[PDB]
Enzyme design. Structure first.
Site, PDB file in Angstrom:
ATOM      1  N   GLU A 233       0.809  -1.084  -0.186  1.00  0.00           N
ATOM      2  CA  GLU A 233       0.007  -0.184   0.120  1.00  0.00           C
ATOM      3  C   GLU A 233       0.762   1.294   0.006  1.00  0.00           C
ATOM      4  O   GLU A 233       1.647   1.355   1.015  1.00  0.00           O
ATOM      5  CB  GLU A 233      -0.977  -0.022   1.165  1.00  0.00           C
ATOM      6  CG  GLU A 233      -1.585   1.276   1.602  1.00  0.00           C
ATOM      7  CD  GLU A 233      -2.273   1.244   2.819  1.00  0.00           C
ATOM      8  OE1 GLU A 233      -2.824   0.327   3.360  1.00  0.00           O
ATOM      9  OE2 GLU A 233      -2.259   2.262   3.586  1.00  0.00           O
TER      10      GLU A 233
ATOM     11  N   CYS B 244      -1.808   8.464   3.791  1.00  0.00           N
ATOM     12  CA  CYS B 244      -1.767   8.137   2.503  1.00  0.00           C
ATOM     13  C   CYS B 244      -3.076   8.510   2.012  1.00  0.00           C
ATOM     14  O   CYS B 244      -3.217   8.761   0.641  1.00  0.00           O
ATOM     15  CB  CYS B 244      -1.586   6.766   2.375  1.00  0.00           C
ATOM     16  SG  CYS B 244       0.236   6.365   2.723  1.00  0.00           S
TER      17      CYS B 244
END
Ligand SMILES: Cc1cc2nc3c(=O)[nH]c(=O)nc-3n(C[C@H](O)[C@H](O)[C@H](O)COP(=O)(O)OP(=O)(O)OC[C@H]3O[C@@H](n4cnc5c(N)ncnc54)[C@H](O)[C@@H]3O)c2cc1C
Lengths: 980, 977
Positions: free
Chosen positions: A736, A770
């Site tokens: 990720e 993020c």
């Protein structure tokens, strides 16, 4: 109480009789609004379309917006209901007329004029100032000054008003006793950052403005009522009322709203009366049922909080009657405003007051302006003391108010709907609600797998609770008694110390050292890999249900330490109280969810149905997993990646980020408390420059789970692809990586929602997510208005240490982060134009100003590169097509958001705004396990989504066993065989 | 009808008398006073025990040590207290002896003479394990000759059994005293209708040798009937032999009333006998292979050849017996049944039709239905016992079959002698039972499509299927010589670089010329795919699936044609070729359904005021790099998976199977696939291989082929180049070094042919092929002798000739590489077998078996991809598993074992992607055997299974706050109040 109840019922019967079949305008099928509401009530799809259209209506400020929205909400003219460009004009005029029905005016002068007309018709008033959500100090000042302006106008007029007639008392007062000027104020409109997370700060800010209004009210001997809003602010508002009252203990005309639909209200009313007695003051209570029922039920269910409202409607009615009796019994200390359109409720109050012989100066009746007309007129006739709650001001918040009135009137459980639309039986309408409750509860008196309850997300911290508010400072203090320890490696169940130590410090106060962390060299990483490889065979052979049990025990261990684990994160990495708690709850969620997922996936399934044959499809682990974790979600993402690898039968070598190594040690504590077998989990913090490639390159690694930057992720992917001598598998990547996430603000966006959601998306936890919004892409025609409100809200927030809950955000992760982000801010300031740059505290701490930069275009560096800090780029799109094109203009595709109330634009975004997680009409951060499985492709990841039903398969490989079951011409017949 | 009722009454009355004269007398198997009766009683009461007991008897003769016996007993029956060595052995052996007349020829002959003195005729059968070699066929043949010689010397001293008149030297005055039955497939280890003529001749040549000896004795030969697979072969053997000896009356054939075909087969044979003016004899039976035929048909999507209601077989028997009796002038009849209704029906029908006694007799199996046998002797007087003799090993297999027959739920014997059934139900006209059962039996796919089912395998029992291959191979030969262009963006693109494609079994035969794509053309195809992608991505998943379904129907319509191309272009045998096309069809049908299943967004979470929908999106342009060994199947699987999930494909077939690659172009064109969605770019790997893999517009690579190439692709694909949108996704199936373990207790009758097929099917050119056979120490010599002996029977030659087992390998390069490996193996181990190969042209590598192989050896580790089988001798089962796991591969594996403990250990520890128990380890089918592994054999993706399509996509979530102004719509699955 049968005798009283009989009087109440007869009073109700006389009331319905005096109404003479009259319907309130909203139920008048001869009127346009009546036809509109009639169809809404018969057709739920239409109701949703019509009510949502009325909500978006005041934003439809050009002919194109209006025409398009009309078609999108109602379809083409031929497909619309009969009662519905000429179409633009007719619909517009009818909706505007509906809204005017509920408001006494648009200007102060007009309001005052209309209030005098009401008086001539025999009605008193309580005046309310319509306003959009207060999102700034300037907006709170405008609201405040509008009340002051109103009071000044009323001061000049009230002397010329004859008091409404009464049975006795003072001829200069209404009904001989009530002040002629009565106003109601919404406390949260006085402070844009009202939040029980900063309880004291919220109370003071609101109180200081309420005091200013109250002083002017007292100056003309008027009444001030403090209204009650959502449950989130209920304790704050109670405290504001109590303080203001004690400041003016001798002034009688100050009221508070209490909501009978709250389970808390029995206690709250009792507490307030006892408080008034103890302090020897009097109070006034406007008892209402409550205005936010659907909201409270939804909000509580979204957060695993106890629903704070009753959920059987008769329970609220029964609570009202019970609480009204309590108030009337205490008329000596408590003045009563009965605020209800329900004839049973009104009748109950009338008869209880008569039975208790309450003086008429101790109770009055109130209804909302412009609705329940026959009820209003009936009260005037029977009770004589009736006050209209009368809002005034701008049509924009007036439309929002209109939608709320339409919802109230058309609700299935609405007394008004049942009386005036549904022809409900009078005996049922006037039934003792206590009897209704018993019958309803009795009626209502008449899933997980493998003995486990179904998955549900762990309850979020709830700062409406005094105990939750008190827990944080206590737990932060306890953590401080634990500082200065040396944290060793943990390998094969044993502590292994090295002599390379790196301190971990408080980013909001770097002089505060939390401890020293041992660093693993290649030798120790190799040892950890060896230990994991040796534990793998027995762990792989452990039953999946048993492996899952360890995760469930770890979850319980974490749950028992929730505030403690949270406190460590506040100090070590600068999480705000809510952010830290949510990190720990998310870790718990991964453990509970992945435990259940392995249980689900752990049973071999028969595939195919041919007889004489059994094929079983099942999954096996890969081997040793390298888990390389970020600092920004130091428990959640670490626990998620590690526990998924562990529950699937792999063994883990885990490298936390240096600056959150202590949080990484929590995984050691948790898995050891769960009794996890030695070697299954190994903790090896280390310098990436020493052992980073070594860990990734090692032949005995079979999978790598990484969350962090694109640069590091891509390097890992490239290196992992090589098969070295002795390497058993092609290495599996679970990755990720970053995002450059945009939120689109469409022309028709609700800015009351968009603005605080964008602010939180951009600046929550310093922008270090993020998923964070780093680009806000705003449509041309709403740009100036949006940016003014966003900047003004930003200006109200404070940057400072996360241990102080008054601060919105604080220091970024470490010195390197601060320098990097500040450099990006300077780059952006030369690309676009600075719109806001916050103050920061003087002295030590890795503070970066909350920064907003406008004029940004896709070709700019700060429109493309992930900054990972509090720097927000604002981009001005010429049309919606360009907004989408711009949203899609980066190499990333992780999260995105859109605020829009256009079905066509939302559909286009669902299809074309191709991020892994797209959010409509809310912030784009804070993804929850199961609800929002998280992750994307492009340069944001490899299409793996943590917290979802495809995740665990990435940690395993499938196997099939096929058995020929036929021996000597016979085979057992199995249940799912295709047979004869 | 009225006549029907009347005759049925006489039958029922005859059955009632038959039962009355039995009165409490039970067959010994139903004697609950004996150990045998007790074991069967519990088997009939408990199906779990039945399965354990019957499987134990099957494995029993392999339990040759105290260790094997003791452990199997515990593993089958549990500890000695959860149950209901020297002792249990004696009981099972005594059970088996009840059904055989002896273990040697001399003992059999002595016992047969004893039976004669008790008034019973016989038909003698020779027990044997399955025939797996020519030597075994010769032993079986010579045993009959030996028997006949022994009987020849004795029969002259035998008085004929008493009758009513005729020849006092014949049985009942008319029947030959010597009567034998022979199992046709026991005469030829490769009996197979795929080589129909070859099978008939080989069997006929041995049967003729036996028959000549029978005729010398003036005896009777009955040709027994076996499984449906060989029924037509056997009929043709009988017909040829009969016409060679048209005047000799004592030749019989068995016909099975349980076959739907039998009404027609009996009509045909009777008409055939009339046309040729010969006489015949038929032993009519119901049939011995019911469960097997049902399972086998269902496993292959064939019509079940047997009736599936038991009364239907009974009804067919009585119907067919009548037809034979009607034809008694040309057809002698042996009624072979233990069913009192059936027997009574035959007796009454013979009476009704006034059939002379010399035209019908009754037969039962030795050792069962004793009172029924006694009754027939008393009433009819002409009763013959089917009397097998021989070794206890096949004697145990025979025992199991008799135990199954006697204890079946629908067994007439069980119902009569265990269930105490009502006599009226037992003697009911089975035609009435049929109607009732049909009526009772008279009283799921998704999105309107039928559920998935694998396409029917080619069925060489059918004359039309046998004839289709030569026809279609010839038709394909009229279409050779073409030049095959690239296919890019819906257009044929020629280039100046042509590579010929030839027949590997006859390299002088050129099938066509293939244009090669340079990097320019490959870049053009990628650009075409990229341009087509946005509209294809936005096409409804159900619509995309429809294209695959159309392509599947297009292929289904061209099945034999598509197969024939593979026979010639890459040397596929007829069955291998057809299976390649059916697999292609299966991928299309299966992936269409999978995309439909996965194509609708699903709500996730249940919190109100919120809607989260989770769904999938394609990636972009997929490079599909395909192998030659499954040139349509794997190509179509990879390409159609990528296409149906919304990607667009640039496809590189292997050079030597480029025409099969072109078949994908033809099929997608017929389906009407939008231009650019599939592009066909064969080319030289050295010119455009890295270009295709490296290209920045590629988001996915689907590769199947060698580890070496696969690993290179994975390494290069990991790099993100300028302008590259995604991290490239790898879907890769690579090689194997697959072992089959042969445990001490393995059924070698199954293990041997399955291993031979696993190793040498399609010349061993399968990633799933068995290249290692790991054999337990104590069964090593026995297993290897039978394996080598079966191998010696097979022929190597062109795949277009169905007589050949395997043929040439793929090309000159493969041949050179495989031969080098063979030489390496010969220096590492010792050659056990190396076949002849044809002289002249063709890329022939001998069928090669090499022993003495250990895990350190190169041919125990490296994938050869050809007909070279390593034999490894394991000292115990623990080492067998250790050795199976000793390579860097983990694709497939097999184990032959009848040990629950060892099978359990293998399921856990033999960690291949596809482990097979008691069958070959090749031939994985879509859905049933999703295929693929990890280690160096792949990346854990499994074609043909329910996780496969997700690998071609990426998930997305849309989350919507549905609350506006304090209200939200209530959705059905909301957590609410
Ligand atoms: C003058 C005036 C001032 C007001 N000020 C405020 C304020 O400051 N803050 C505030 O929150 N409200 C306030 N209200 C109340 C709110 O706006 C509604 O008008 C009121 O709750 C409607 O109640 P009722 O007796 O008119 O009608 P009814 O139809 O009798 O009662 C409906 C009420 O029952 C409740 N209810 C609905 N469904 C359920 C259920 N399934 N389970 C349990 N309870 C249910 C809701 O509270 C709903 O409003 C005020 C009302 C008036 C008249």
């Amino acid at each position: 109480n049968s005798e009283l109840n009989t009087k109440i019922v007869n009073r109700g019967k006389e009331f319905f009789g005096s109404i003479s079949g009259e319907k309130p305008s909203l139920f008048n099928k001869g009127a346009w609004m009546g036809k509109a509401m009639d169809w809404s009530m018969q057709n739920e799809q239409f109701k949703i379309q019509m009510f949502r259209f009325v909500d978006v209506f005041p934003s439809l400020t050009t002919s194109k917006l209006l025409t398009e929205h009309i078609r999108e909400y109602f379809g083409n003219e031929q497909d619309m209901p009969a009662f519905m460009a000429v179409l633009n004009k007719v619909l517009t005029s009818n909706i505007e007329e509906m809204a005017r029905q509920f408001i006494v005016g648009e200007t102060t002068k007009e309001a005052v004029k209309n209030l005098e007309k009401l008086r001539k018709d025999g009605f008193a008033a309580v005046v309310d100032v319509l306003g959009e959500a207060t999102l700034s100090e300037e907006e709170a000042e405008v609201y405040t000054n509008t009340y002051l302006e109103l009071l000044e106008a009323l001061k000049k007029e009230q002397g010329s008003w004859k008091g409404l007639p009464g049975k006795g008392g003072d001829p200069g007062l209404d009904w001989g006793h009530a002040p002629k000027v009565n106003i109601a104020v919404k406390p949260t409109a006085l402070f844009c950052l009202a939040n029980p997370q900063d309880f004291e700060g919220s109370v003071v800010a609101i109180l200081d403005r309420m005091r200013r209004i109250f002083k002017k009210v007292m100056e003309l001997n008027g009444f001030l009522c403090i209204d009650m809003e959502s449950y989130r602010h209920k304790e704050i508002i109670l405290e504001v009322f109590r303080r203001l009252k004690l400041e003016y203990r001798d002034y009688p005309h100050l009221g508070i709203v209490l909501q009978a639909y709250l389970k808390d209200n029995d206690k709250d009313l009792d507490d307030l009366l006892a408080w008034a007695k103890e302090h020897k003051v009097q109070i006034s209570v406007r008892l209402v049922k409550g205005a936010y029922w659907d909201y409270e039920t939804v909000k509580a269910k979204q957060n695993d909080w106890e629903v704070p409202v009753w959920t059987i409607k008769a329970e609220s009615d029964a609570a009202y009657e019970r609480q009204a009796r309590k108030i009337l019994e205490n008329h000596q200390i408590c003045h009563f405003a009965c605020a209800s359109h329900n004839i049973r409720t009104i009748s109950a109050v009338m008869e209880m007051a008569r039975e208790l012989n309450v003086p008429e100066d101790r109770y009055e009746f109130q209804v909302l302006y412009g609705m329940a007309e026959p009820v209003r007129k009936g009260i005037l006739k029977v009770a004589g003391r009736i006050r209209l709650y009368a809002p005034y001001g701008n049509m924009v918040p007036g439309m929002g108010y209109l939608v709320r009135r339409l919802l109230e009137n058309t609700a299935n459980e609405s007394f008004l709907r049942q009386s005036f639309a549904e022809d409900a039986q009078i005996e049922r309408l006037l039934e003792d609600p206590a009897v209704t409750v018993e019958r309803e509860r009795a009626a209502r008196a008449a899933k997980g797998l493998g003995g486990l309850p179904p998955f549900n997300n762990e309850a979020m911290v709830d700062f409406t609770r005094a105990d939750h508010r008190a827990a944080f400072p206590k737990h932060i203090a306890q953590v401080r008694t634990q500082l200065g320890k040396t944290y060793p490696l943990f390998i094969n169940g044993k502590e292994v110390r090295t002599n390379d130590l790196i301190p971990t410090v408080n980013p909001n106060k770097p002089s505060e050292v939390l401890g020293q962390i041992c660093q693993a060299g290649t030798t120790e990483v190799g040892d950890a890999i060896a230990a994991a490889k040796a534990a793998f065979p027995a762990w792989r052979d452990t039953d999946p249900r048993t492996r899952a049990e360890y995760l469930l025990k770890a979850a319980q261990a974490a749950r028992k330490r929730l505030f403690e684990l949270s406190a460590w994160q506040v100090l070590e990495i600068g999480k705000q109280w809510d952010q830290a708690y949510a990190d720990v709850t998310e870790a718990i969620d991964f453990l509970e969810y992945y435990a259940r997922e392995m249980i689900r996936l752990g049973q071999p399934q028969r595939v195919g149905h041919a007889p004489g044959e059994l094929n079983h499809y099942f999954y096996e682990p890969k081997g040793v997993a390298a888990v390389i974790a970020p600092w920004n979600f130091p428990l959640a993402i670490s626990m998620g990646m590690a526990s998924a690898a562990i529950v699937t039968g792999n063994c883990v070598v885990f490298k936390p980020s240096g600056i959150t190594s202590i949080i990484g040690w929590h995984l050691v504590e948790l898995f050891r408390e769960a009794g996890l077998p030695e070697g299954v989990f190994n903790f090896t913090p280390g310098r990436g420059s020493v052992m980073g490639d070594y860990l990734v390159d090692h032949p005995d690694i079979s999978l790598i789970a990484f969350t962090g930057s694109m640069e590091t992720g891509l390097r890992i992917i490239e290196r992992a692809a090589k098969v070295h001598p002795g390497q058993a598998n092609v290495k599996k990547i679970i990755s990720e990586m970053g995002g450059k996430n945009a939120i689109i603000i469409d022309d028709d966006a609700d800015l009351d929602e968009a603005v605080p959601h964008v602010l939180y998306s951009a600046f929550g936890f310093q922008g270090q997510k993020c998923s964070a919004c780093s680009r806000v892409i705003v449509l041309d025609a709403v740009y100036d208005k949006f940016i003014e409100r966003l900047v003004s809200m930003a200006k109200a927030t404070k940057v400072g240490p996360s241990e102080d809950p008054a601060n919105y955000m604080g220091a970024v992760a470490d010195d390197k982060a601060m320098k990097s982000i500040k450099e990006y801010a300077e780059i952006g300031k030369r690309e676009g134009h600075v719109l806001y740059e916050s103050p920061v505290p003087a002295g030590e701490g890795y503070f970066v100003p909350m920064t907003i930069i406008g004029g940004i275009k896709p070709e700019h560096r700060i429109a493309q590169e992930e900054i990972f800090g509090p720097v927000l780029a604002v981009m001005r799109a010429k049309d919606f097509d360009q907004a989408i094109e711009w949203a899609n203009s980066t190499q990333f595709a992780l999260t995105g958001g859109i605020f829009s109330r256009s079905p066509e634009h939302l559909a286009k975004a669902r299809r074309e705004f191709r991020v892994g997680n797209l959010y409509i009409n809310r912030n784009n951060t804070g993804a929850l396990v199961e609800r929002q499985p998280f992750g994307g492709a492009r340069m944001s990841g490899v299409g793996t989504k943590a917290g979802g039903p495809d995740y665990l398969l990435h940690f395993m490989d499938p196997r099939v066993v096929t058995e020929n079951t036929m021996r000597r011409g016979f085979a057992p017949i199995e249940e799912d065989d295709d047979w004869v």
